[PDB]
RNA sequence: AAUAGGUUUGGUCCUAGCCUUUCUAUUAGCUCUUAGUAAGAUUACACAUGCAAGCAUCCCCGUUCCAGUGAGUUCACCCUCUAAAUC
């Protein structure tokens, strides 16, 4: 659990190392901010000018306890207990 | 409650129900009241179902329903 | 007359509508016959009780 | 549950709690129990004044005249609510118990005279 | 004990013992539930001073008799709202028991409700499209001849005496089961002097 | 899914029917009245006092 | 003839639309409530300014001004007086018709009073049982305390005018009576203490300027705009003042000398203006640092 | 993780996101295409994507597949009049198919709004009753209305207990 | 146009053709699974009343509900070949096709 | 099953069952001050006694409801058609 534990952490992509690795704006919307674009980060080298191809449906693999948690259908007596602050 | 089929009480077998007594002007006043007052909700019983007919046949075969129905089935063509 | 309520319902509608009339609004109640409580009922129509001989 | 004839009916349905009486105003049929299955809910009626001193009253206007219209019948209190509120005429028996409460009155009124005059 | 902030408790968190004991982190922060197991029961325990008495470990509210729960120590009622959500702390959140909970959501909100607390405060929508005062709900109907007049709305709200023939034949129709012929009854309802 | 037929009831149900046809009561029985009790003999049950 | 403008012309909605101002860090500042996980889209230059584009739209939406109201008439018709029903009851009824499908203004409320009347709810009366079945999110039956004199103090003391708006205007309906005494009295504090930027990219300014010009009460705020080096919200403010007075003493003197630009507030600095001095005081300020920053 | 690809399928909000709300007209719904053929797959990125989307909004209309019957792929639909609607379908992508059959059979935005509108008077806020149903279960709940008495006690005078004691 | 039968108009497959002027008539629907959220074929049998005995076992039929049942199991009336088992002709084009190959060139009528 | 934890071995890793911690209900033990409110036979076993359906100028109407139970158990929902009943 530790070593899996920082070589996940090691190895994670900052915002602006994806900025850099696709040359285009990172920007972050938040819905305590509303519409408002907030970019957190920008390419150092040139901007790219043709957008991110938009694939109508992503081919990535989902997590069914995310999606069955999202779909109201993860019931645990377990899950969401009250707990002291850490 | 009881069903039908319950025997009566006997403690009840031989009770009378003697009707109240009556004041002449009073009880002639108020039948004259329930008259008025009948006429008068019967005729709002009617208007009342003459709004709930209207509606439906409105609905049914109003002009702003058969006119969308003409629109919607030419929009279909 | 209408009741009190459903008279001010009635003109306020006129109103919304663009009728400026004065005219009161009227229940007909020539159409209600009220017929006295005595009056003979329609005897085909009657019940009639049901055989347990005591 | 198809009972054996029957008709709507609008009613006060009794809710609350013991000492606090709400009362729901529905449409049901009349053999349903009084706090049981109805057809539709047409207002509330709260007994107990608020603390403005007001007894509130809501009435689905609109639904109450589309139920009579269909044959619903009026309980006896629903129609006195109805009277007060103006969209019935004043009932019959509130018409006469205001004037059977103002003779109990003149009574009480002219034996504390009669009382005084003698002291 | 006796508090001498009771009267100003928010002097208390402005002083230098308030600054040695807890610093600049919550009241809260150091404060450890015992139990059994990992998770821990859903519930604090109900008060930690009964009849007088403290407990062994008693809650962060609880422990420093200096901390008073008012509406007016803001900064102490801070301790126990998400700075970035704006929520109370559940009651397993701090270790506050139950007693001591309550007094504090009570005491927050009544520090909203006098505008000394900042609080999110959303921008809603008018409850009406139009704002038109011309319906008749709202502005005079017509008066009805009746009550032009002052009659009664229908004529039977009044007692009209019924003729005698009439009296007589209900007199017949209820010989020996008849009360006292009653008369028009007062125009206005009596009051006792 | 098909109910199974309760003949029982039905047979029951006609010979009621046909019961109360053949031995229905006259008018002689259902509407008799004891004049000194005020009570129809074929039921036992008294007149209202408004009627006596 | 001739009338004046209302609030929501079309020319008196420009100018106080952009005296107002949009400001998207203010306008979508980060609500302090319940948040979730951001999302993060890659974005070109031409995808980051249409986005930023679409926010403006979201926010000229937002600040959107609400209507001024005049107050409301006081409710007082009877509809019927049945005094047969005269002390048969103790406490009034108040009946409210909660069919769906009414506005709120149209829907009859009536009160049967101990004394037998028959009439019309008062103005408090409606928009309390209006919220008794028909509960608006943000809306109190009772009144909440923060209005009063005393509360209100507290918030204006840490300057939240906007807050204090944002309560009246979920409490109060715009036509109201305490709806209108409280945006006078905040209006008016923030008068008095220079604290004009607090509403400014707020759907509350409008109302704000729309209270002084009627009240000939411009002079804090047009010092505030010079002081801002914002001559052309100055400058508009001066000629909305002329519009709703057309017949004043600085309107004729615009028209006699057919002033233009920063010349408007000269004029209005000499002839109504009450606090003339510090205008022209103010002014003559801004023009120096404008010639500094020409040479 | 979710088996298959594409596991987005497989979830309620990608169902509900077919904007596809058949006319009540339409009853049946054929779809014949082709395995294998470059002017072909539109019609079978449509099955693979879409067609679970039109059932999920469109629950009662019968959607019948079939594979490699005819050269070229189409549409075709059945209405209740007994009319039927032929969608040639050859060359076209899956978001064409989509936009078109919504435009020729499809409700419009207007419909659809019109239909949730109504849905919103069968809960009248007015109304008391179970969560389930209402908002409120009582007007206990009412701010200014005597609170229910399971969290405030009534006063003596306002409970039977002592009505009676005292008159009797 | 009103009927007591639920299926008004509905395909499906011929599976058998023994009974005399009736074909029993494979239907099938997709149905969501609700824990995989996955549409699977649920198939029923209709009996649909074939006067000319023209149905052939294999072919697509579209199956008309009649005013009322005409037999216990029969509901339904043939109303259209769709797709003759073999002989499947390309409704786009017109012409015949065996599978994905046209028997007759749409070019020969241009 | 969760933020998980304990337990196989001389020891480690893996798999795996069991149990712990959480929240309710019933019963038992021991113990128990007040007020308000909600809820309240184990048993479709057998039941002492009392009461639970009358109304009304006779006809009728009602006692086919309400209240009860959970034995049996895809008669409950939608559409079509169409009685009785209310207006
Ligand atoms: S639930 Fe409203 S009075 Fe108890
Ligand atoms: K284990
Ligand atoms: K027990
Ligand atoms: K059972
Ligand atoms: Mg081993
Ligand atoms: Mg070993
Ligand atoms: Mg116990
Ligand atoms: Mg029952
Ligand atoms: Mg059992
Ligand atoms: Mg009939
Ligand atoms: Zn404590």
Not at chain 4, 76 to 91: D, R, S, V
Request: hydrophobic share 35%; net charge positive.
């Amino acid at each position: 659990l530790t070593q899996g534990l920082f070589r996940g952490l090691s190895r994670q992509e900052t915002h602006q190392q994806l900025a850099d690795k696709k040359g285009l704006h990172v920007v972050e919307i938040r819905e305590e901010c509303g519409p408002l674009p907030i970019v957190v980060a920008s390419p150092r080298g040139p901007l790219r000018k043709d957008p991110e191809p938009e694939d109508e449906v992503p081919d990535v693999k989902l997590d069914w306890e995310d999606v069955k948690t999202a779909q109201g259908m993860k019931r645990s007596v377990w899950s969401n207990l009250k707990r002291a602050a850490t | 409650r009881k069903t039908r089929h319950d025997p009566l009480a006997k403690s009840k077998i031989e009770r009378v129900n003697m009707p109240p007594a009556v004041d002449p002007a009073e009880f002639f006043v108020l039948m004259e009241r329930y008259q008025h007052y009948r006429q008068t909700v019967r005729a709002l019983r009617m208007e009342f179902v003459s709004e709930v007919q209207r509606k439906v046949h409105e609905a049914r075969a109003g002009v702003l329903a058969e006119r969308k129905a003409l629109k919607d089935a030419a929009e279909h063509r | 007359p209408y009741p009190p309520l459903l008279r001010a319902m009635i003109i306020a509608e006129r109103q919304k509508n663009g009728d400026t009339s004065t005219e009161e609004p009227m229940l007909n109640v020539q159409r209600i016959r009220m017929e006295p409580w005595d009056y003979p009922a329609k005897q085909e129509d009657k019940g009639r009780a049901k055989g347990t001989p005591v | 549950k198809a009972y054996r004839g029957g008709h709507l009916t609008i009613r006060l349905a009794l809710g609350g709690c013991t000492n606090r009486p709400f009362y729901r105003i529905v449409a049901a049929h009349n053999k349903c129990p009084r706090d049981g299955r109805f057809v539709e809910q047409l207002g509330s009626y709260d007994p107990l004044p608020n603390s403005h001193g007001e007894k509130l009253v809501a009435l689905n206007l609109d639904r109450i005249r589309h139920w009579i219209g269909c044959g619903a019948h009026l309980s006896k209190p629903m129609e006195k609510l109805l009277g007060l509120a103006g969209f019935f005429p004043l009932h019959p028996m509130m018409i006469t118990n205001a004037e059977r409460l103002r003779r109990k009155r003149a009574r009480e009124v002219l034996l504390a005279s009669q009382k005084t005059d003698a002291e | 004990p006796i508090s001498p902030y009771k009267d100003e408790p928010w002097k208390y968190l402005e002083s230098e013992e308030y600054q040695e004991r807890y610093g600049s982190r919550p009241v809260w922060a150091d404060y450890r539930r015992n139990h059994k197991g990992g998770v821990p029961p859903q519930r604090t325990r109900k008060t930690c001073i009964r009849r007088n008495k403290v407990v062994g470990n008693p809650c962060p509210i609880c422990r420093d008799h200096k901390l008073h729960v008012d509406f007016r120590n803001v900064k102490l009622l801070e301790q126990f709202v998400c700075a970035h959500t704006g929520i109370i702390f559940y009651a397993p959140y701090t270790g506050v028991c139950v007693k001591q909970h309550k007094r504090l959501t009570q005491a927050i909100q009544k520090a909203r409700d006098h505008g000394l607390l900042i609080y999110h405060i959303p921008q809603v929508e008018p409850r009406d499209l139009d704002f038109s005062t011309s319906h008749g709900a709202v502005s005079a109907t017509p008066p009805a001849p009746t009550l032009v007049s002052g009659d009664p709305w229908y004529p039977w709200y009044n007692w009209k005496q019924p003729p005698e023939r009439e009296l007589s034949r209900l007199r017949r129709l209820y010989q020996g089961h008849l009360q006292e012929e009653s008369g028009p009854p007062p125009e206005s309802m009596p009051k006792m002097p | 899914k098909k109910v199974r037929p309760r003949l029982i009831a039905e047979l029951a149900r006609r010979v009621r029917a046909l019961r109360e046809q053949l031995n229905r009561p006259r008018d002689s029985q259902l509407y008799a009245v004891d004049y000194e009790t005020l009570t129809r003999p074929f039921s036992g049950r008294r007149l209202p006092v408004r009627a006596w | 003839e001739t009338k004046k403008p209302t609030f929501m012309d079309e020319e008196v909605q420009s100018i106080l639309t952009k005296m107002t101002g949009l400001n998207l860090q203010k306008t979508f500042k980060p609500a302090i409530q319940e948040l979730k996980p951001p999302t993060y889209k890659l974005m070109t230059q031409a995808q980051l300014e249409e986005a930023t584009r679409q926010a403006v739209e979201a926010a000229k939406v937002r600040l959107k001004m609400p209507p001024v109201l005049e107050e409301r008439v006081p409710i007082n018709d009877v509809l019927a007086e049945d005094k047969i029903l005269e002390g048969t009851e103790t406490t009034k009824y108040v009946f409210t018709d909660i069919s769906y499908s009414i506005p709120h203004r149209e829907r009859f409320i009536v009160v049967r009073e101990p004394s037998g009347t028959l009439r019309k709810a008062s103005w408090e009366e409606r928009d309390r049982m209006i919220q008794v079945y028909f509960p608006k999110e943000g809306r109190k039956i009772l009144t909440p305390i923060i209005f009063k004199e005393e509360n209100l103090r507290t918030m204006y003391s840490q300057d939240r005018h906007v807050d204090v708006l944002n309560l009246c205007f979920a409490q109060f309906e715009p036509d109201s009576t305490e709806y209108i005494k409280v945006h006078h009295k905040t209006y008016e504090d923030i008068d008095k203490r220079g604290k004009y930027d607090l509403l400014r990219s707020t759907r509350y300014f409008g109302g704000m300027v729309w209270y002084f010009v009627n009240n000939k009460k411009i002079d804090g705020l047009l010092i505030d705009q010079i002081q801002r080096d914002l001559i052309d919200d100055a400058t508009n403010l001066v000629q909305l003042y002329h519009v709703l007075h057309p017949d004043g003493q600085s309107a004729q003197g615009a028209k006699d000398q057919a002033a233009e630009g920063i010349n408007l507030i000269k004029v209005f600095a000499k002839t109504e203006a009450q606090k003339g001095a510090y205008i022209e005081l103010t002014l003559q300020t801004y023009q120096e640092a404008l010639s500094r920053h020409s040479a | 993780p979710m088996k298959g690809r594409f596991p987005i399928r497989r979830t309620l909000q990608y169902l509900s996101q077919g904007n596809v709300v058949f006319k009540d007209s339409v009853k049946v719904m054929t779809v014949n295409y082709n395995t294998h053929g470059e002017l072909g797959e539109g019609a079978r990125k449509f099955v693979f994507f879409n067609i679970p989307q039109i059932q999920y909004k469109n629950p009662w209309v019968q959607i019948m597949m079939f594979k490699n019957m005819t050269p070229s792929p189409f549409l075709r639909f059945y209405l209740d009049s007994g009319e039927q609607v032929l969608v040639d379908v050859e060359t076209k992508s899956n978001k064409e198919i989509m936009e078109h059959i919504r435009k020729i059979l499809g409700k419009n935005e207007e419909t659809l709004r019109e239909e949730e509108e109504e849905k919103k008077q069968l809960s009248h806020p007015a109304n008391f009753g179970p969560r389930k149903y209402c908002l409120r279960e009582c007007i206990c709940e009412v701010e200014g209305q005597v609170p229910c008495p399971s969290l405030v006690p009534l006063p003596k005078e306002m409970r039977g207990k002592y009505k009676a004691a005292l008159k009797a | 146009v009103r009927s007591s039968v639920h299926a008004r108009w509905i395909v499906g497959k011929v599976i058998g053709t023994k009974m005399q002027k009736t074909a029993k008539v494979r239907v099938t629907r997709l149905v969501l699974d609700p824990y995989l959220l996955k549409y699977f074929n649920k198939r029923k049998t209709y009996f649909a009343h074939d006067a000319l005995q023209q149905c052939t076992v294999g072919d697509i039929v579209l199956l008309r509900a009649l005013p009322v049942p005409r037999a216990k199991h029969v509901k339904h009336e043939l109303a259209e070949i769709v797709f003759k088992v073999g002989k499947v002709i390309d409704p786009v084009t017109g012409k015949p096709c065996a599978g994905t190959t046209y028997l007759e060139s749409p070019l020969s009528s241009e």
